């Protein structure tokens, strides 16, 4: 579940170009339910109406997937070869990269234990949020108390993996907030107990990870773009 600000992003009529799926590089792990929903939808209508948003990888014959991970993965699993795509000026100041703020209503002790079980530390620390925003720890975990979760990407992946696991199990309610202060607003309402805060990746870091053949956890990047492409008229049969 997502709570984003009411982003007035304009729709613009940008044309698409077919790009081969094997030239597209993901920067996040897939979410299997999102993959499956895309597959049901596209095969249901046989129309692919939402172009991929791509960025050329400097120095390679390859494109970063900016938006479209499950479209990409779902088309590949169906046997398709290409997708209609819009190529972005990614390094333009008009494109911004934020993150998501996983927030939870639930009990901190089950969550702290099942983080500790996957190898993480969870250390009470009043500077945790400050450290996380400078990118010095994996996450700050902030509610009634404040906890530092040390590490880097490996530990961020475990946190995401645990928060999704105990969703799958059913012990927690979980909103990904676009803004941490909207999670802190709702925190004060009683609807949210804890929020996980990490530093957002930069563009250069996103490219760097992709060039290393690595990926972030789901819900790591939150791109704010200068436009949403207008919808397109492409038949699924055209993609094979
Ligand atoms: N028939 C379709 N053609 C293209 N995109 C679709 C279709 N049905 C659903 N979607 C989108 O597929 C996306 C799957 O997630 P992602 O590709 O990660 O953005 C969602 O944003 C859906 O809106």
UniProtKB/Swiss-Prot annotation:
GO terms for molecular function: ATP binding; kinase activity; metal ion binding. InterPro entries: ParB/Sulfiredoxin_dom (IPR003115), ParB/Sulfiredoxin_sf (IPR036086), SerK/SbnI_C (IPR023098), SerK_C (IPR040867). Disruption phenotype: Disruption of gene does not lead to complete Cys auxotrophy, but mutant displays a growth defect in an amino acid medium depleted of Cys. Gene3D superfamilies: Conserved hypothetical protein from pyrococcus furiosus pfu- 392566-001, domain 2, Conserved hypothetical protein from pyrococcus furiosus pfu- 392566-001, ParB domain. Mg(2+) binds at residue 67. The active site is at residue 28. It catalyses: L-serine + ADP = O-phospho-L-serine + AMP + H(+). Disulfide bonds: none annotated. Keywords: ATP-binding, Kinase, Magnesium, Metal-binding, Nucleotide-binding, Transferase. Signal peptide: none annotated. It is an enzyme of class 2 (transferase). SUPFAM superfamilies: ParB/Sulfiredoxin. The keyword Isomerase does not apply. Its cofactor is Mg(2+). Pathway: Amino-acid biosynthesis; L-cysteine biosynthesis; L-cysteine from L-serine: step 1/2. Its EC number is 2.7.1.226. O-phospho-L-serine binds at residues 66, 68-70, 100, 219, 221, 223. ADP binds at residues 41, 47, 49-50, 67-71. GO terms for biological process: cysteine biosynthetic process. Free serine kinase that uses ADP to phosphorylate L-serine to yield O-phospho-L-serine and AMP. Belongs to the SerK family. This is ADP-dependent L-serine kinase SerK. It comes from Thermococcus kodakarensis (strain ATCC BAA-918 / JCM 12380 / KOD1).
């Amino acid at each position: 579940v997502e709570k984003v600000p009411k982003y007035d992003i304009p729709t613009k009529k940008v044309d698409y170009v077919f790009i081969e799926l094997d030239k597209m590089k993901p920067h996040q792990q897939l979410v299997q339910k999102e993959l499956e929903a895309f597959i049901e939808s596209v095969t249901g209508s046989g129309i692919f109406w939402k172009p991929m948003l791509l960025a050329k990888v400097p120095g390679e014959d390859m494109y970063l997937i900016v938006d479209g991970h499950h479209r990409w993965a779902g088309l590949q699993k169906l046997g398709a070869k290409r997708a209609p795509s819009v190529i972005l000026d990614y390094f333009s100041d008009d494109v911004k990269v934020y993150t998501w703020y996983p927030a939870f209503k639930g009990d901190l002790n089950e969550v702290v234990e099942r983080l500790k079980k996957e190898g993480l530390e969870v250390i009470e620390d009043p500077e945790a949020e400050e450290k996380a925003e400078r990118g010095e720890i994996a996450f700050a975990l902030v509610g009634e108390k404040s906890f530092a979760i040390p590490g880097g990407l490996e530990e961020q992946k475990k946190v995401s993996k645990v928060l999704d696991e105990m969703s799958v199990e059913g012990k927690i309610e979980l909103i990904y907030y676009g803004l941490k202060e909207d999670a802190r607003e709702d925190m004060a309402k009683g609807e949210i107990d804890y929020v996980f805060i990490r530093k957002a990746p930069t563009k250069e870091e996103v490219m760097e990870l992709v060039k290393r053949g690595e990926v972030y956890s789901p819900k790591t990047t939150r791109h704010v773009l200068p436009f949403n492409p207008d919808k397109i008229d492409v038949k699924l049969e055209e993609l094979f």
